[PDB]
């Protein structure tokens, strides 16, 4: 299609330029073309018409250009709200369109945050179903990768975790969550449980317990 | 202002056609639009499926898929719809609505100015299941001081999505939705918590609002003190 690199990488402040390779029928046949920017989970926004026109509300620090058949986004003064999947896309000759396959951009340098951890023992009502959840929360943490194990009074459980990958929140730290799915046999058979989240050489040791 | 919002089931079975509509708010399906459906497979990139262009109604689809599309207008209603027959695995994907605006369409091409919020469908044989809310009973100690965290947990539901709100949207500062885990069983769950004063506990309720569309279900589960 439109040839983008698969991701590229540069730290705050700095400046990155995305490439966006195509054809005579495209990119080199118009001056058509125009950039994307997603964030996970939500729509992809314009930035960038007709090469180098930027619509209202789009910040200066996005510009277009194009030489041949190669088309270029450059960023300018790099923010962590720059981290996003970059695409571009044309018009092509008989009346269709083509996007490229994305770049993901990497903003480093960013600070480090350690992990708040909130635990919660399952309720009354579950417990009831035979079944007990315990809900591991983990928040507010960069760079974007933590470790969790669980404990049952303190020897190692690998049975019944599932653990998401971490996802930036609005303030573009991490967030994920764990959970350990047990009986209610289970849950009641032993003095506590624990969730320990490790970040950057350190441990967060939350217990909860039957009481 | 222009706004296109997208609806349509979020499961389809294999073999079965997929339908999704994009309602458009604050212009004319009517107009020089080229009115667009894009998908994005999971951890893939976005991908054209076709057009149907507002003023005269004529459709170009992506030669890959021009077998299985249809794009049509409904111009009461305001509305332009997508239908993809003999689905299977490969068509499970985000599916965006876009307006593509044009000048001299021979000279720069269009661009897609408007987009829907994306609707993910599902290509499975698996049943629709709503979820079991249980609450999570405040805890102070992982918060600042004076307040608690309370949340509630979504449990074992399927299709996605899930979206949760406290006290029928009347709380908003300090709420957390995480992001769903997908369970070995393929069912999903997911928790919300919110930080409160603890001032509030046993005077002010705390209800988390749980709405899953796909099963048509909603969960007002209130969230107190254990006993
Ligand atoms: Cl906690």
């Known amino acids: 299609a439109l040839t983008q690199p698969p991701s590229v990488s540069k730290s705050l402040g700095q400046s990155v330029t995305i490439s966006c390779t195509g054809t005579?029928?495209?990119?080199?046949?118009?001056?058509?073309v125009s950039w994307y920017q997603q964030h996970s989970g939500t729509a992809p926004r314009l930035l960038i018409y007709?090469?180098?026109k930027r619509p209202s509300g789009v910040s200066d620090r996005f510009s277009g250009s194009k030489s041949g058949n190669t088309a270029s986004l450059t960023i300018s003064g790099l923010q962590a709200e720059d981290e996003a999947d970059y695409y571009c896309?044309?018009?092509?000759?008989?009346?269709?369109?083509?996007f490229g396959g994305g770049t993901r951009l990497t903003v480093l340098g960013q600070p480090k945050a350690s992990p708040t951890v909130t635990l919660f023992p399952p309720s009354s009502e579950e417990l009831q179903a035979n079944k007990a959840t315990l809900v591991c929360l983990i928040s507010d943490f960069y760079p974007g990768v933590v470790k969790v194990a669980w404990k049952a009074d303190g020897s190692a459980v690998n049975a019944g975790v599932e653990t998401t990958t971490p996802s930036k929140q609005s303030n573009n730290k991490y967030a994920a969550s764990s959970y350990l799915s047990l009986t209610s046999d289970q849950w009641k058979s032993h003095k506590s449980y624990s969730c320990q989240v490790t970040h950057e050489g350190s441990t967060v040791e939350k217990t909860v317990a039957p009481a | 202002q222009v706004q296109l919002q997208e609806s349509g089931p979020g499961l389809v079975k294999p073999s079965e056609t997929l339908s999704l509509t994009c309602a458009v708010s604050?212009?004319?399906?009517?107009?020089?639009?080229?009115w667009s459906w894009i998908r994005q497979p999971p951890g893939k990139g976005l991908e054209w499926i076709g057009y149907?262009?507002?003023?005269?109604?004529?459709?170009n689809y992506n030669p890959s898929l021009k077998n299985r599309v249809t794009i049509s207008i409904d111009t009461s209603k305001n509305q332009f719809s997508l239908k993809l027959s003999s689905v299977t695995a490969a068509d499970t994907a985000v599916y965006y609505c876009?307006?593509?605006?044009?000048?001299?369409?021979?000279?720069?091409?269009?661009?897609?100015?408007?987009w829907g919020q994306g609707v993910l469908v599902t290509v499975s044989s698996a049943s629709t299941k709503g979820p079991s809310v249980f609450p999570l009973a405040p805890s102070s100690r992982s918060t600042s001081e004076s307040t608690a965290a309370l949340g509630c947990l979504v449990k074992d539901y399927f299709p996605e999505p899930v979206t949760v709100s406290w006290n029928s949207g009347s709380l908003t500062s300090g709420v957390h939705t995480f992001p769903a885990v997908l369970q070995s069983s393929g069912l999903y769950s997911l928790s919300s918590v919110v930080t409160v004063p603890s001032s509030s506990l046993g005077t002010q309720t705390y209800v988390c609002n749980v709405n899953h569309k796909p099963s048509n279900t909603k969960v007002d589960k209130r969230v107190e003190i254990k006993t």
């Open positions: 896309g044309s018009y092509r000759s008989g009346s269709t369109w083509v």
């Open positions: 876009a307006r593509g605006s044009y000048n001299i369409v021979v000279l720069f091409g269009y661009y897609f100015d408007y």
């Open positions: 005579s029928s495209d990119i080199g046949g118009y001056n058509g």
């Open positions: 007709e090469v180098s």
């Open positions: 604050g212009g004319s399906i009517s107009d020089d639009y080229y």
């Open positions: 149907i262009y507002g003023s005269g109604g004529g459709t």
